[PDB]
Amino acid sequence: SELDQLRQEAEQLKNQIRDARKACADATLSQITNNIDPVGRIQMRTRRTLRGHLAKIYAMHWGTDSRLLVSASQDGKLIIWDSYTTNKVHAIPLRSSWVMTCAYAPSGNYVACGGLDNICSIYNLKTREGNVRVSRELAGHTGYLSCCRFLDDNQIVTSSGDTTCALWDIETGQQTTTFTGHTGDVMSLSLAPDTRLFVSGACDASAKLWDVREGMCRQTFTGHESDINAICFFPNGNAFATGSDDATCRLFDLRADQELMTYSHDNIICGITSVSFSKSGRLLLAGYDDFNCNVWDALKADRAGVLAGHDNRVSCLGVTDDGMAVATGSWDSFLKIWN
Amino acid sequence: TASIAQARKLVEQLKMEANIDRIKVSKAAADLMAYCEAHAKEDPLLTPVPASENPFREK
Amino acid sequence: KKILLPEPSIRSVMQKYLEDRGEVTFEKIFSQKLGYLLFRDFCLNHLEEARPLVEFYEEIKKYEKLETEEERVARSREIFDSYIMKELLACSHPFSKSATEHVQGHLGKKQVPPDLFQPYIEEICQNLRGDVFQKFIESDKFTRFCQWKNVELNIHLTMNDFSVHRIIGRGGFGEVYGCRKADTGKMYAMKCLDKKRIKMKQGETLALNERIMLSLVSTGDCPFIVCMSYAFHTPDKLSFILDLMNGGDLHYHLSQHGVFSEADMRFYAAEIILGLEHMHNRFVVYRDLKPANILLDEHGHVRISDLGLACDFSKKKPHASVGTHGYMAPEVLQKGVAYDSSADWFSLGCMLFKLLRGHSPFRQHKTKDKHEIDRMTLTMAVELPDSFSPELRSLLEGLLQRDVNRRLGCLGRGAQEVKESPFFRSLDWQMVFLQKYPPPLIPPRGEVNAADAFTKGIKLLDSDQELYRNFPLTISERWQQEVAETVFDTINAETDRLEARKKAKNKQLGHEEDYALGKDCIMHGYMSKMGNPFLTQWQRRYFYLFPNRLEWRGEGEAPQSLLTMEEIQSVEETQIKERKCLLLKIRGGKQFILQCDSDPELVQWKKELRDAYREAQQLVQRVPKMKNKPA
Numbered sequence A: 001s002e003l004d005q006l007r008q009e010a011e012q013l014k015n016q017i018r019d020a021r022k023a024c025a026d027a028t029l030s031q032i033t034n035n036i037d038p039v040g041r042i043q044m045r046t047r048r049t050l051r052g053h054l055a056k057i058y059a060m061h062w063g064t065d066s067r068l069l070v071s072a073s074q075d076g077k078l079i080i081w082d083s084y085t086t087n088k089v090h091a092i093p094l095r096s097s098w099v100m101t102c103a104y105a106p107s108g109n110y111v112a113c114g115g116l117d118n119i120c121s122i123y124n125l126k127t128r129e130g131n132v133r134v135s136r137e138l139a140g141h142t143g144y145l146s147c148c149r150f151l152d153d154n155q156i157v158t159s160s161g162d163t164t165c166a167l168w169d170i171e172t173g174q175q176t177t178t179f180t181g182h183t184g185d186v187m188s189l190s191l192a193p194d195t196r197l198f199v200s201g202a203c204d205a206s207a208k209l210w211d212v213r214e215g216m217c218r219q220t221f222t223g224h225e226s227d228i229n230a231i232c233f234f235p236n237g238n239a240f241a242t243g244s245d246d247a248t249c250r251l252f253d254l255r256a257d258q259e260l261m262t263y264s265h266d267n268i269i270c271g272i273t274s275v276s277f278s279k280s281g282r283l284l285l286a287g288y289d290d291f292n293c294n295v296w297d298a299l300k301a302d303r304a305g306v307l308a309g310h311d312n313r314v315s316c317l318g319v320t321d322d323g324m325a326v327a328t329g330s331w332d333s334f335l336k337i338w339n
Numbered sequence B: 001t002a003s004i005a006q007a008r009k010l011v012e013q014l015k016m017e018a019n020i021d022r023i024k025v026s027k028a029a030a031d032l033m034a035y036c037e038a039h040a041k042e043d044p045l046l047t048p049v050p051a052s053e054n055p056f057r058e059k
Numbered sequence C: 001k002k003i004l005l006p007e008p009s010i011r012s013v014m015q016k017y018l019e020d021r022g023e024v025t026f027e028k029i030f031s032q033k034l035g036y037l038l039f040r041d042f043c044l045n046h047l048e049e050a051r052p053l054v055e056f057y058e059e060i061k062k063y064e065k066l067e068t069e070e071e072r073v074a075r076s077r078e079i080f081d082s083y084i085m086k087e088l089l090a091c092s093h094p095f096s097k098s099a100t101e102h103v104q105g106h107l108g109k110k111q112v113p114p115d116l117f118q119p120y121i122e123e124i125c126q127n128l129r130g131d132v133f134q135k136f137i138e139s140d141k142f143t144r145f146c147q148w149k150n151v152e153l154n155i156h157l158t159m160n161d162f163s164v165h166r167i168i169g170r171g172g173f174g175e176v177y178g179c180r181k182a183d184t185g186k187m188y189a190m191k192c193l194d195k196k197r198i199k200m201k202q203g204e205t206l207a208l209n210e211r212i213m214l215s216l217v218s219t220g221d222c223p224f225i226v227c228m229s230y231a232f233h234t235p236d237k238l239s240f241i242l243d244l245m246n247g248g249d250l251h252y253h254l255s256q257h258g259v260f261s262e263a264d265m266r267f268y269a270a271e272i273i274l275g276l277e278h279m280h281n282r283f284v285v286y287r288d289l290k291p292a293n294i295l296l297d298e299h300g301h302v303r304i305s306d307l308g309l310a311c312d313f314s315k316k317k318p319h320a321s322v323g324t325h326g327y328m329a330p331e332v333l334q335k336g337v338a339y340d341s342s343a344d345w346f347s348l349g350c351m352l353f354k355l356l357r358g359h360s361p362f363r364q365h366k367t368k369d370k371h372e373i374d375r376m377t378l379t380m381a382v383e384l385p386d387s388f389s390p391e392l393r394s395l396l397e398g399l400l401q402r403d404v405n406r407r408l409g410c411l412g413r414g415a416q417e418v419k420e421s422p423f424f425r426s427l428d429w430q431m432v433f434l435q436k437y438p439p440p441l442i443p444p445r446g447e448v449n450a451a452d453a454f455t456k457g458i459k460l461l462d463s464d465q466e467l468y469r470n471f472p473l474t475i476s477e478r479w480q481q482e483v484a485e486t487v488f489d490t491i492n493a494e495t496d497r498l499e500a501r502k503k504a505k506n507k508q509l510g511h512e513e514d515y516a517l518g519k520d521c522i523m524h525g526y527m528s529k530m531g532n533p534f535l536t537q538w539q540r541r542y543f544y545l546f547p548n549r550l551e552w553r554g555e556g557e558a559p560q561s562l563l564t565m566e567e568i569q570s571v572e573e574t575q576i577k578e579r580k581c582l583l584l585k586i587r588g589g590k591q592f593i594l595q596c597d598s599d600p601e602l603v604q605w606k607k608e609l610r611d612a613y614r615e616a617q618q619l620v621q622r623v624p625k626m627k628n629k630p631a
């Protein structure tokens, strides 16, 4: 039949892709980097302990100022922290308790969050009389909000457990673009620095590269055995790192269109919750379900450092734009700044 | 999912994914490494910055 | 030792508590005394759309109670002009075609029964139900209603709630005391049955039956029956709180007065008839009608007392030989013979006769043998004196007909047939009900000692007390009336001036902002969590229940602590120092105890906590970021 033919043609097409990828595997990243000096053991201490949330922290995000940062907890609040002094700038009681993701706008004027409400709630910080209030509630997803990132103050991109991502026009609250393709809950996304592209990681154990403007998927990276919980771009935007329930992080190059590296160890069985690169991209930081964040040599895949402080799962992490510090958020209701 | 439209949409997608230009892994990796070496001097977590520069140690 | 209303914050809990039983509808609250009282206060003061609708409702309710056709003619034309015609003239009439036509027709014919405005009442209630009910619910009158309703549902009476005075009755099983309920200051009769005596004599079913019976009857405000407001018990005393009747009984006064005249007995008969009627409407046969079980109040009016040997025939008929000998009907005495209201008419005849001749019809020459007293009942017509009136005769003749086929009050229309007796030609039965007829015997000054009838090696066990489990009770109508008629006004006033001070204090303080508004809070209000048990440390905090957590806070601060729904393994009911608490079991094996201020709070906190924790956990289970995994 016609339907059988397209099942077949899609199978031959999947091989043609694998083969084309094998055709480029002339060397490995590990061979290439086999020469250069290892990084040495990274020795970060806890500078700040950010105390305030009354329950599990589910997510965080740094301001572009490398100082202010927003956080979303099970206690149904968002806190915008001055990391330098530990002073809370704002504490924001949310209209839903089931928050999972938060984001800080590039300008530092708006912030966003959402979760099982199925809504991306945008919050203007500099209101006309000192207060904070919801400027917009972006509604359209038929599943929970897994993640969300501003393009600018007028545009934002969301991922959802309805297996889609979306681009919104904040002024009008419209759903400009939908990024259908994933076959499972989308769990995380990362914007390319150009912000013409972004990637998504999902419970179908695949990552995807999407063109923002064109609104379609360019490339699909598979490899992980389990759900992909986190994802971050390499600083040059030619590659990205993923972290999964499979206890491994992985590095995918876009132009080679395949996996370059796997970051793992036999003493790590538990899953990765979050990933972030250091400013140069040489270090890959990963937060784990065993309460530690591990610091990885992105080029040699040796475990370099281990951030051990938190008493429960590290649910989220982030490196500053000036690259001075690492924030880590946790189920123990604390955020810590490492340096 | 006996959707003929849905099947067509997958196939044509797998073309978009298949028919691209790929570079060799060795070229890809070399470019990555060349980046990390270029910006290694601009990464505080990679290199020792004095307390004077660091806005966290002694304030 | 007055009633103290809970804080307005009680609404969050109560509103849900009532919401769960469908008890928040116009119908349900409007047909409650305190509810109605508050609903009109809203409509008549704090609203203008409804003010006229309720005034009209009331003026009619007053019109129903007018004592004459002469009064009705006048007030009808007044009410019609004032409330119906004025609005009609303008054109803005808010009532149906037929409703207005129904009334105006009867007015052009000067025939004004106290019901002509019944079609308006229903259409007033149409106009009030819903749209306006909504605004009332949203108003703090409903809050005030939730405050009283909380007190109502948190009643657990004891002896200490009563100022108990002298003894005014003595029965085989117990005693009756005059008492005042300190609470409101209401005068009552307290009936104390010794459990040890009940066990001894095996009269448990009897004690239990009276309670069950009293409850079928103690609604509707009946002047001619001793009715219950509360029942409760101590470990060894069943206590009934009852209508006060401190003027002895007829069996006594009869012995002090001697026999009564036809006119004197007529009075008693009328009142008893009506009290019979009441029971017979509610499908209850008294089955023990006697001068000893008819009491007198301070003024001389009578009530039927002691419903131990009464019975409900609604579902199935009784057939047992039960009652006092000399007053049992043929159909009763005969075993394997079913019956209903029937018996009490026969019993009536027997007692009324006693009033006139001083002995039972079937008890001449003071013979004690009760077997042959019964023989005179089945196939033997009664012989009557040469000095009875012809009307008294035909009454007693009809009342004591052996055949129920041909007995007075057993032909269909029941009590009406008896009232229609030419013995009562002179009576206006409405005027009997209003207790306007002067009583023939007024009880004396020095206490009567006038309600008497004619060893222990005994313990009380688990299985004895379990008989008295459903015993305690409170009749809502009774308590609301008692409250409405004593303190309801003065308490609301004191409460209002208290709540308004705390609000006006908090305006200056700046504490006045509710943490619960604008979020997804399920429920909130005070509880007390246990700190260190050895220090009697109990800590009243204000709690906020959210779908995924339970927060709480102290005096003038945000919530600093909480407890996630994920943590909670169970919500159990528990006891500490004779206080009901909730016991939450927490993942770490940790315990969390909470005392509530009232039963409905405990009931609702348990339900809603249980609901939340189960739902949240089922939900998180389906959410990769939140669910727990293999660590």
Ligand SMILES: O=C1N=Cc2cc(OC[C@@H]3CNCC[C@H]3c3ccc(F)cc3)ccc21
Binding pocket: C168, C169, C170, C171, C172, C173, C174, C175, C176, C188, C189, C191, C192, C193, C226, C242, C243, C244, C245, C246, C249, C292, C293, C294, C295, C305, C306, C451, C452, C453
């Ligand atoms: O004020 C009162 N309210 C009920 C009542 C009942 C009452 O006695 C009822 C019985 C009438 N016939 C003789 C025995 C009386 C009685 C029956 C049971 C009892 F426990 C105490 C007294 C006396 C006074 C009052």
